[PDB]
Protein backbone atom coordinates (compact mmCIF):
# COMPACT_ATOMS: atom_id res chain seq x y z
CA UNK A 1 0.00 0.00 0.00
CA UNK A 2 1.55 3.49 -0.76
CA UNK A 3 0.26 6.73 0.90
CA UNK A 4 -0.62 9.57 -1.47
CA UNK A 5 -3.24 12.30 -2.04
CA UNK A 6 -4.54 14.00 -5.40
CA UNK A 7 -1.87 16.76 -5.35
CA UNK A 8 -2.99 19.77 -2.69
CA UNK A 9 -6.30 17.31 -1.06
CA UNK A 10 -6.18 17.91 2.45
CA UNK A 11 -8.07 15.28 3.57
CA UNK A 12 -10.45 15.91 6.92
CA UNK A 13 -12.49 14.28 9.84
CA UNK A 14 -15.94 14.04 8.86
CA UNK A 15 -17.24 15.13 5.63
CA UNK A 16 -14.65 14.80 2.59
CA UNK A 17 -15.87 16.98 -1.18
CA UNK A 18 -14.29 17.17 -4.53
CA UNK A 19 -12.15 14.21 -4.22
CA UNK A 20 -10.76 13.99 -7.97
CA UNK A 21 -10.82 10.77 -9.42
CA UNK A 22 -11.04 9.64 -13.57
CA UNK A 23 -12.76 12.79 -14.23
CA UNK A 24 -15.07 12.86 -11.29
CA UNK A 25 -15.65 14.79 -7.73
CA UNK A 26 -16.35 11.96 -5.08
CA UNK A 27 -17.21 12.40 -1.41
CA UNK A 28 -16.30 10.21 1.79
CA UNK A 29 -17.00 10.66 5.28
CA UNK A 30 -13.89 9.92 8.16
CA UNK A 31 -14.55 8.70 11.51
CA UNK A 32 -11.30 8.33 12.76
CA UNK A 33 -10.59 5.35 15.68
CA UNK A 34 -11.12 5.67 18.76
CA UNK A 35 -9.16 4.02 21.91
CA UNK A 36 -6.38 3.48 19.43
CA UNK A 37 -2.70 3.57 19.56
CA UNK A 38 -1.00 3.24 15.92
CA UNK A 39 -2.16 1.90 12.66
CA UNK A 40 -5.96 0.97 13.00
CA UNK A 41 -8.11 -1.57 11.56
CA UNK A 42 -10.01 0.13 8.32
CA UNK A 43 -13.85 0.06 7.87
CA UNK A 44 -15.12 0.54 4.42
CA UNK A 45 -18.94 0.89 4.66
CA UNK A 46 -21.21 1.06 1.52
CA UNK A 47 -24.93 1.82 1.83
CA UNK A 48 -27.42 0.27 -0.67
CA UNK A 49 -30.09 1.65 -3.31
CA UNK A 50 -32.20 3.67 -1.16
CA UNK A 51 -30.57 4.43 2.24
CA UNK A 52 -28.32 7.66 2.19
CA UNK A 53 -24.76 7.05 3.07
CA UNK A 54 -25.62 8.84 6.26
CA UNK A 55 -28.70 6.37 7.10
CA UNK A 56 -26.19 3.71 6.63
CA UNK A 57 -23.54 5.35 9.25
CA UNK A 58 -25.81 7.12 11.13
CA UNK A 59 -29.26 5.38 11.57
CA UNK A 60 -29.62 1.94 13.82
CA UNK A 61 -31.63 0.22 11.32
CA UNK A 62 -29.63 1.09 8.71
CA UNK A 63 -26.54 -0.20 10.78
CA UNK A 64 -24.91 2.95 12.22
CA UNK A 65 -21.43 1.69 10.68
CA UNK A 66 -19.89 5.26 12.08
CA UNK A 67 -19.97 3.60 15.46
CA UNK A 68 -17.69 0.93 14.32
CA UNK A 69 -15.28 4.23 14.84
CA UNK A 70 -16.07 3.55 19.18
CA UNK A 71 -14.42 0.15 18.25
CA UNK A 72 -11.27 0.98 17.04
CA UNK A 73 -11.86 1.11 13.52
CA UNK A 74 -11.02 4.41 11.40
CA UNK A 75 -14.46 4.24 8.99
CA UNK A 76 -13.91 6.03 5.42
CA UNK A 77 -17.24 5.48 4.09
CA UNK A 78 -17.85 6.33 -0.28
CA UNK A 79 -20.93 8.04 -0.95
CA UNK A 80 -22.47 6.97 -3.97
CA UNK A 81 -21.41 8.76 -7.17
CA UNK A 82 -25.52 9.27 -8.34
CA UNK A 83 -25.80 11.05 -5.31
CA UNK A 84 -23.53 14.07 -6.49
CA UNK A 85 -21.62 14.62 -3.38
CA UNK A 86 -24.47 14.54 -0.98
CA UNK A 87 -24.39 11.98 1.78
CA UNK A 88 -27.86 12.42 2.69
CA UNK A 89 -29.36 11.33 -1.10
CA UNK A 90 -31.32 8.35 -0.28
CA UNK A 91 -33.20 6.79 -3.63
CA UNK A 92 -33.13 9.80 -5.63
CA UNK A 93 -31.60 9.52 -8.83
CA UNK A 94 -30.02 6.43 -7.50
CA UNK A 95 -32.63 3.72 -7.17
CA UNK A 96 -32.82 2.70 -10.77
CA UNK A 97 -30.86 0.64 -13.64
CA UNK A 98 -27.76 2.03 -14.26
CA UNK A 99 -26.44 3.39 -17.75
CA UNK A 100 -22.51 3.62 -19.48
CA UNK A 101 -22.73 -0.13 -19.48
CA UNK A 102 -23.55 -0.64 -15.92
CA UNK A 103 -26.25 -2.59 -14.39
CA UNK A 104 -27.19 -1.03 -11.69
CA UNK A 105 -26.35 2.74 -10.69
CA UNK A 106 -26.04 2.74 -7.24
CA UNK A 107 -22.56 1.87 -7.54
CA UNK A 108 -20.61 1.18 -10.40
CA UNK A 109 -21.00 -2.84 -8.89
CA UNK A 110 -21.48 -4.99 -12.46
CA UNK A 111 -21.41 -4.79 -16.14
CA UNK A 112 -25.12 -4.48 -17.96
CA UNK A 113 -26.65 -7.49 -19.80
CA UNK A 114 -26.36 -5.90 -23.47
CA UNK A 115 -23.46 -5.09 -25.04
CA UNK A 116 -22.71 -2.06 -24.09
CA UNK A 117 -20.61 -3.70 -20.58
CA UNK A 118 -18.49 -5.95 -22.54
CA UNK A 119 -15.63 -2.87 -21.37
CA UNK A 120 -16.74 -3.87 -17.84
CA UNK A 121 -15.55 -7.69 -18.19
CA UNK A 122 -12.10 -6.50 -17.42
CA UNK A 123 -12.01 -2.98 -16.32
CA UNK A 124 -13.00 -2.42 -12.47
CA UNK A 125 -14.86 0.62 -12.97
CA UNK A 126 -14.21 3.84 -11.43
CA UNK A 127 -15.72 3.20 -7.86
CA UNK A 128 -13.41 0.31 -7.28
CA UNK A 129 -10.51 2.59 -8.39
CA UNK A 130 -12.29 5.31 -6.31
CA UNK A 131 -12.30 3.33 -2.71
CA UNK A 132 -8.11 2.43 -3.52
CA UNK A 133 -7.37 5.88 -4.27
CA UNK A 134 -9.84 7.15 -1.04
CA UNK A 135 -7.68 4.53 1.51
CA UNK A 136 -4.61 5.95 -0.03
CA UNK A 137 -5.18 9.55 0.93
CA UNK A 138 -6.67 9.20 3.38
CA UNK A 139 -3.65 7.35 4.89
CA UNK A 140 -1.66 10.05 5.21
CA UNK A 141 -3.60 12.03 8.01
CA UNK A 142 -4.59 8.88 9.80
CA UNK A 143 -2.45 6.11 10.46
CA UNK A 144 -4.03 2.72 9.15
CA UNK A 145 -3.24 -0.68 9.49
CA UNK A 146 -2.32 -1.96 5.82
CA UNK A 147 -2.65 -5.52 6.11
CA UNK A 148 -6.45 -4.54 7.49
CA UNK A 149 -8.01 -2.81 5.36
CA UNK A 150 -11.96 -4.20 4.78
CA UNK A 151 -14.78 -2.89 3.10
CA UNK A 152 -18.12 -3.89 3.35
CA UNK A 153 -22.20 -3.02 2.35
CA UNK A 154 -25.77 -3.80 1.69
CA UNK A 155 -27.75 -4.43 -1.26
CA UNK A 156 -25.92 -2.79 -4.45
CA UNK A 157 -22.82 -2.26 -1.40
CA UNK A 158 -22.81 -5.94 -1.19
CA UNK A 159 -22.63 -6.18 -4.60
CA UNK A 160 -20.04 -3.46 -4.93
CA UNK A 161 -18.15 -5.20 -2.32
CA UNK A 162 -18.21 -8.52 -4.38
CA UNK A 163 -17.02 -6.50 -7.27
CA UNK A 164 -13.89 -4.81 -5.38
CA UNK A 165 -12.49 -8.21 -3.95
CA UNK A 166 -12.49 -10.12 -7.38
CA UNK A 167 -10.45 -6.52 -8.93
CA UNK A 168 -8.27 -5.52 -5.71
CA UNK A 169 -7.56 -8.72 -3.93
CA UNK A 170 -4.03 -7.46 -3.81
CA UNK A 171 -5.05 -4.24 -1.81
CA UNK A 172 -7.96 -4.84 0.42
CA UNK A 173 -7.82 -7.68 3.05
CA UNK A 174 -11.33 -8.84 3.57
CA UNK A 175 -14.56 -7.60 3.07
CA UNK A 176 -18.15 -8.10 4.22
CA UNK A 177 -20.77 -8.52 1.31
CA UNK A 178 -24.23 -8.62 2.99
CA UNK A 179 -26.97 -9.66 0.34
CA UNK A 180 -25.12 -8.72 -2.57
CA UNK A 181 -25.88 -9.57 -6.13
CA UNK A 182 -23.24 -12.07 -8.62
CA UNK A 183 -25.40 -11.55 -11.58
CA UNK A 184 -24.79 -15.13 -12.30
CA UNK A 185 -23.92 -15.84 -16.05
CA UNK A 186 -23.05 -18.64 -18.22
CA UNK A 187 -19.43 -20.03 -18.30
CA UNK A 188 -18.96 -18.44 -21.84
CA UNK A 189 -20.05 -14.86 -20.18
CA UNK A 190 -23.46 -14.79 -21.62
CA UNK A 191 -25.65 -12.39 -19.38
CA UNK A 192 -28.74 -14.04 -17.78
CA UNK A 193 -32.26 -13.05 -17.01
CA UNK A 194 -33.03 -12.84 -13.42
CA UNK A 195 -35.14 -16.31 -13.84
CA UNK A 196 -32.52 -17.82 -15.61
CA UNK A 197 -29.64 -17.21 -13.44
CA UNK A 198 -31.77 -17.86 -10.62
CA UNK A 199 -32.10 -21.26 -12.35
CA UNK A 200 -28.28 -21.94 -12.85
CA UNK A 201 -27.41 -21.89 -9.59
CA UNK A 202 -30.20 -24.45 -8.13
CA UNK A 203 -29.40 -26.56 -10.74
CA UNK A 204 -25.67 -26.68 -10.11
CA UNK A 205 -25.44 -25.38 -6.32
CA UNK A 206 -21.99 -26.59 -5.80
CA UNK A 207 -20.07 -25.15 -8.78
CA UNK A 208 -18.69 -21.93 -9.33
CA UNK A 209 -20.76 -19.48 -11.40
CA UNK A 210 -19.59 -16.49 -13.54
CA UNK A 211 -21.00 -13.47 -13.14
CA UNK A 212 -21.66 -9.56 -14.15
CA UNK A 213 -20.09 -8.47 -10.95
CA UNK A 214 -16.63 -9.48 -11.42
CA UNK A 215 -13.73 -9.82 -14.29
CA UNK A 216 -15.13 -12.33 -17.40
CA UNK A 217 -13.72 -14.84 -16.82
CA UNK A 218 -13.63 -14.67 -12.95
CA UNK A 219 -10.15 -14.78 -11.90
CA UNK A 220 -8.63 -18.34 -11.54
CA UNK A 221 -6.66 -17.28 -8.09
CA UNK A 222 -6.89 -14.13 -6.27
CA UNK A 223 -4.73 -12.22 -3.53
CA UNK A 224 -5.08 -13.30 0.15
CA UNK A 225 -8.36 -12.63 2.01
CA UNK A 226 -10.98 -13.27 4.56
CA UNK A 227 -14.41 -12.70 3.33
CA UNK A 228 -17.51 -12.90 5.48
CA UNK A 229 -21.00 -13.73 3.10
CA UNK A 230 -24.25 -13.06 4.37
CA UNK A 231 -27.75 -14.14 3.48
CA UNK A 232 -30.98 -12.86 5.17
CA UNK A 233 -33.26 -15.85 4.67
CA UNK A 234 -36.60 -16.64 2.82
CA UNK A 235 -37.36 -12.86 2.46
CA UNK A 236 -34.06 -12.05 1.19
CA UNK A 237 -35.43 -10.70 -2.13
CA UNK A 238 -35.11 -7.75 -3.96
CA UNK A 239 -38.57 -5.76 -5.77
CA UNK A 240 -37.92 -3.30 -8.64
CA UNK A 241 -39.55 -0.36 -9.21
CA UNK A 242 -40.96 0.53 -12.62
CA UNK A 243 -41.53 4.00 -14.15
CA UNK A 244 -45.29 3.82 -13.29
CA UNK A 245 -44.90 2.55 -9.28
CA UNK A 246 -45.38 -0.52 -9.80
CA UNK A 247 -43.01 -3.79 -8.28
CA UNK A 248 -41.80 -6.96 -9.40
CA UNK A 249 -38.83 -9.09 -8.60
CA UNK A 250 -36.03 -8.45 -9.94
CA UNK A 251 -33.45 -10.25 -7.27
CA UNK A 252 -33.12 -12.95 -4.93
CA UNK A 253 -29.98 -13.52 -2.51
CA UNK A 254 -30.01 -17.00 -2.09
CA UNK A 255 -28.35 -17.96 -5.45
CA UNK A 256 -25.77 -15.17 -4.75
CA UNK A 257 -24.31 -15.21 -1.55
CA UNK A 258 -24.52 -19.25 -2.78
CA UNK A 259 -22.37 -18.62 -5.73
CA UNK A 260 -19.91 -15.69 -4.12
CA UNK A 261 -19.38 -18.28 -1.33
CA UNK A 262 -18.53 -21.23 -3.85
CA UNK A 263 -15.80 -18.80 -5.59
CA UNK A 264 -14.16 -17.22 -2.26
CA UNK A 265 -14.25 -20.87 -0.84
CA UNK A 266 -12.61 -22.54 -3.19
CA UNK A 267 -9.52 -20.16 -3.44
CA UNK A 268 -6.68 -21.25 -1.17
CA UNK A 269 -5.81 -17.73 0.13
CA UNK A 270 -9.21 -16.96 1.18
CA UNK A 271 -10.91 -17.89 4.32
CA UNK A 272 -14.79 -17.64 3.64
CA UNK A 273 -17.44 -17.34 6.24
CA UNK A 274 -20.81 -17.92 5.53
CA UNK A 275 -23.83 -16.90 7.44
CA UNK A 276 -27.44 -16.84 7.50
CA UNK A 277 -29.99 -15.17 9.12
CA UNK A 278 -33.38 -14.00 9.44
CA UNK A 279 -34.15 -10.00 8.72
CA UNK A 280 -34.80 -10.50 5.22
CA UNK A 281 -32.62 -8.08 2.71
CA UNK A 282 -31.94 -4.82 4.82
CA UNK A 283 -28.37 -4.37 7.62
CA UNK A 284 -28.94 -7.19 9.44
CA UNK A 285 -31.55 -6.49 12.35
CA UNK A 286 -30.85 -8.71 15.51
CA UNK A 287 -28.41 -7.92 17.83
CA UNK A 288 -27.21 -5.27 14.83
CA UNK A 289 -24.16 -3.48 16.43
CA UNK A 290 -23.24 -7.23 18.10
CA UNK A 291 -23.12 -8.42 14.91
CA UNK A 292 -20.98 -5.09 13.46
CA UNK A 293 -18.70 -5.74 16.41
CA UNK A 294 -18.32 -9.34 15.58
CA UNK A 295 -17.87 -9.37 12.13
CA UNK A 296 -15.44 -6.49 11.80
CA UNK A 297 -13.35 -8.22 15.14
CA UNK A 298 -13.43 -11.75 13.06
CA UNK A 299 -12.28 -9.80 9.73
CA UNK A 300 -9.52 -8.06 11.19
CA UNK A 301 -8.68 -11.65 13.40
CA UNK A 302 -6.86 -12.66 9.77
CA UNK A 303 -4.45 -9.65 8.89
CA UNK A 304 -3.76 -9.95 4.83
CA UNK A 305 -1.75 -12.61 4.14
CA UNK A 306 -2.52 -14.47 7.16
CA UNK A 307 -2.69 -18.53 6.92
CA UNK A 308 -6.07 -19.51 6.63
CA UNK A 309 -5.27 -22.71 8.65
CA UNK A 310 -4.64 -19.79 11.53
CA UNK A 311 -7.85 -18.89 11.37
CA UNK A 312 -10.32 -19.38 14.19
CA UNK A 313 -13.82 -18.72 14.02
CA UNK A 314 -16.10 -17.90 17.28
CA UNK A 315 -19.71 -17.94 17.87
CA UNK A 316 -21.32 -15.07 16.36
CA UNK A 317 -24.61 -13.25 17.92
CA UNK A 318 -27.81 -14.86 18.23
CA UNK A 319 -29.61 -14.50 15.43
CA UNK A 320 -26.68 -15.68 13.06
CA UNK A 321 -25.43 -19.32 12.18
CA UNK A 322 -21.80 -18.76 10.23
CA UNK A 323 -19.31 -21.46 9.23
CA UNK A 324 -16.35 -21.41 7.41
CA UNK A 325 -16.45 -22.62 4.02
CA UNK A 326 -19.25 -22.32 0.85
CA UNK A 327 -23.01 -21.81 2.33
CA UNK A 328 -25.00 -25.16 2.79
CA UNK A 329 -28.42 -24.21 4.10
CA UNK A 330 -29.69 -22.43 1.13
CA UNK A 331 -29.92 -25.39 -1.85
CA UNK A 332 -29.85 -29.78 -1.23
CA UNK A 333 -27.29 -31.41 -1.09
CA UNK A 334 -26.16 -33.98 -3.90
CA UNK A 335 -25.94 -36.93 -1.57
CA UNK A 336 -29.12 -36.28 -0.63
Not at 173 to 199: C, H, K, M, N, Q
Not at 211 to 225: D, F, H, I
Not at 269 to 288: F, I, K, Y
Request: glycine content about 10%; aromatic content about 12%.
Amino acid sequence: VKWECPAGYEVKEGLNVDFPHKGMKRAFIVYPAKNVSGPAPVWVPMTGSVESTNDNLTVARSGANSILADHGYTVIAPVRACANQDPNIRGERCNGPGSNGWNWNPWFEGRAADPSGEHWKNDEGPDSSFFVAMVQCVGTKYKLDARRLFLGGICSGGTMTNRALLFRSNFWAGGLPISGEWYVTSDDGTPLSFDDARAAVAAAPTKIHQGRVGPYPLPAKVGPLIVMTVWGGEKDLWNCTRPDGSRFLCADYRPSTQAGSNFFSAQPDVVHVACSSTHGHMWPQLNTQEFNRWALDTLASHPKGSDPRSFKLTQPPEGYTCHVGPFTGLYASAWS
